[PDB]
Amino acid sequence: MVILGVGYFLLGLILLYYGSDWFVLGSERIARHFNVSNFVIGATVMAIGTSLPEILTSAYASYMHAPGISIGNAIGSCICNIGLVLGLSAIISPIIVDKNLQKNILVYLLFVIFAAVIGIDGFSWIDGVVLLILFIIYLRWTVKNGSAEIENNPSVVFSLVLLIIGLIGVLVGAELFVDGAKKIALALDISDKVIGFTLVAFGTSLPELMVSLAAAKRNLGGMVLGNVIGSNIADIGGALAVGSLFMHLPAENVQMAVLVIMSLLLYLFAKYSKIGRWQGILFLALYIIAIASLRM
Ligand SMILES: CCCCCCCCCCCCCCC
Ligand SMILES: [Cl-]
Ligand SMILES: [Cl-]
Ligand code: NA
Ligand code: NA
Ligand code: NA
Ligand SMILES: [Sr+2]
């Protein structure tokens, strides 16, 4: 079963690599079909589609009476998306944010701060209902300001096929990757549960990572930023929220503070500067410091 672990691992990588490119390409075409910006398609369809692991993991964990894992998943993924995911992408393809998208990032920051404040004492099921609703409002507000009201085609059909098959590719690939790695570690008897549930946020962050990198290579910085901003909101208003429904989630004040600081930096760079190499390097530096000092 060490061989079936290597098999899953490698093929999971292959599915993640090509699958992410198809998802990116299919999303880019869809955005042009619905006359919406790449940021919008990244903030909605791509963000939610790639946060399906987080939502399912947080829901399942809290249902299995592990609310620590549930919120850990969620917040940990947000920190990962800014520090690691956006950090790598910014360096690859620097982003100059237009004033319109700056408003969106400011709203994001407000949402994050609000989540941190109401979460000081933990997250009740009521907290989850509120966040989930703001999640919904955010999506509709984002789509409205990023769409243009104007107008069964083989260009449209091929676009949806690319996106859906691509999405299946990154979700399955990320699962095979995690499966394969864990069954390699079990056959080698180097299995570690504490390390395992430390990487829970990363395994679920695999789709965001590969998808953003794919978009970064094609200079789709708006799509990248949309995917990051939307995934975080999807992780909080979706994964965290659903987790709180099954069970009260314990306070993660240190992690929330880290996320707030990163989110604040993200807004400030977007408004007064750019999200380029040195902003990207800083994000990675902070992320590395984070995974070196935060409790496992
Ligand atoms: C396409 C040209 C890319 C040049 C990339 C330079 C990247 C420097 C990354 C430094 C990361 C530091 C992380 C903390 C040690
Ligand atoms: Cl727990
Ligand atoms: Cl773009
Ligand atoms: Na996501
Ligand atoms: Na994810
Ligand atoms: Na994640
Ligand atoms: Sr609370």
Nearest ligand (C-alpha, residue 288) = 1
Amino acid occupying residue 128 = G
**Residues 10, 110 within the same domain:** no
Closest CA to 53 of 206, 180, 261, 232: 206
Q: What span, in angstroms and rounded, lies between the C-alpha atoms of 286 and 47?
A: 23
Residue 36 DSSP symbol: B
* Substitution site in 279, 284, 288 for ligand 1 pocket (most atoms within 8 Å of beta carbon): 284
Residue tagged 């987790």 (tokens): 243
Cβ neighbourhood burial of 141 (10 Å; 0-12, 13-18, 19+): middle
Query: Experimentally, how was this structure solved?
Result: X-ray
Q: What is the signed CA dihedral for 146, 152, 155, 158, rounded to 10 degrees?
A: 100
Q: How far is the CA of 150 from the centre of ligand 5 (A)?
A: 33
Q: Check if the beta carbon of residue 290 is closer than 8 Å to that of residue 111.
A: no
* Substitution site in 277, 286, 288, 289 for ligand 1 pocket (most atoms within 8 Å of beta carbon): 277
How long a stretch of residues is the chain?
296
* Domain around 18: 1-35+151-191
CA distances from 182 to 52, 101, 179 (A): 20, 40, 5
SS3 category, 296: coil
Of the residues 191, 214, 247, which one is the last residue of a structural domain? 191
Q: Check if the beta carbon of residue 138 is closer than 8 Å to that of residue 111.
A: yes
* Helix (H) / strand (E) containing 215: helix 200-217
CA distances from 194 to 77, 176, 279 (A): 17, 21, 32
**Residues 44, 130 within the same domain:** yes
Closest CA to 43 of 120, 138, 170: 138
**What CATH number is given to the structural domain containing 1?**
6.10.280.80
SS3 category, 273: coil
CA angle 265, 147, 209 (to 5 degrees): 45
Closest CA to 129 of 227, 235, 237: 237
Q: Check if the beta carbon of residue 184 is closer than 8 Å to that of residue 43.
A: no
Q: Give resolution in angstroms.
A: 2.5
Of all protein residues, the one whose alpha carbon is nearest to atom 4 of ligand 1 is 91
Enumerate residues with CB within 5 Å of ligand 3 (an ion).
38, 220, 222
Q: Check if the beta carbon of residue 202 is closer than 8 Å to that of residue 53.
A: no
Q: What span, in angstroms and rounded, lies between the C-alpha atoms of 83 and 133?
A: 27
Of all protein residues, the one whose alpha carbon is nearest to atom 9 of ligand 1 is 281
Q: What span, in angstroms and rounded, lies between the C-alpha atoms of 32 and 79?
A: 30
SS3 category, 152: coil
CA distances from 296 to 43, 191, 195, 197, 200 (A): 30, 15, 7, 8, 11
Secondary structure tally for the chain: helices H, strands E: 15, 0
**Residues 1, 114 within the same domain:** no
Enumerate residues with CB within 5 Å of ligand 6 (an ion).
54, 77, 201, 204-205
Q: Check if the beta carbon of residue 167 is closer than 8 Å to that of residue 49.
A: yes
**Residues 262, 178 within the same domain:** no
Q: How many domains are contained in the chain?
A: 2
**Residues 120, 166 within the same domain:** no
Contacting residues for 242 by C-beta, under 8 A, at least 6 apart: 55, 58, 59, 62, 128, 132
CA distances from 253 to 25, 66, 222, 290 (A): 38, 18, 30, 14
**Residues 77, 146 within the same domain:** yes
**CB-facing half-sphere around the CA of 111: CA atoms within 13 A:** 29
Q: Check if the beta carbon of residue 15 is closer than 8 Å to that of residue 172.
A: yes
Of the residues 162, 191, 220, which one is the last residue of a structural domain? 191
* Helix (H) / strand (E) containing 33: helix 3-33
**Residues 120, 222 within the same domain:** yes
**Residues 69, 138 within the same domain:** yes
**Residues 121, 218 within the same domain:** yes
Closest CA to 25 of 214, 274, 248: 214
Q: What span, in angstroms and rounded, lies between the C-alpha atoms of 215 and 212?
A: 5
**What CATH number is given to the structural domain containing 261?**
1.20.1420.30
**Residues 75, 171 within the same domain:** no
Closest CA to 114 of 293, 270, 236: 236
**Residues 65, 107 within the same domain:** yes
Nearest ligand (C-alpha, residue 70) = 2
Of all protein residues, the one whose alpha carbon is nearest to atom 11 of ligand 1 is 281
Nearest ligand (C-alpha, residue 248) = 7
Q: Check if the beta carbon of residue 243 is closer than 8 Å to that of residue 63.
A: no
Q: Check if the beta carbon of residue 186 is closer than 8 Å to that of residue 62.
A: no
Q: How far is the CA of 152 from the centre of ligand 5 (A)?
A: 32
Which atom of ligand 1 is nearest the CA belonging to 285? 14
Q: How far is the CA of 69 from the centre of ligand 1 (A)?
A: 32
Of all protein residues, the one whose alpha carbon is nearest to atom 12 of ligand 1 is 281
* Helix (H) / strand (E) containing 126: helix 125-145
**Residues 91, 206 within the same domain:** yes
Q: What span, in angstroms and rounded, lies between the C-alpha atoms of 42 and 20?
A: 13
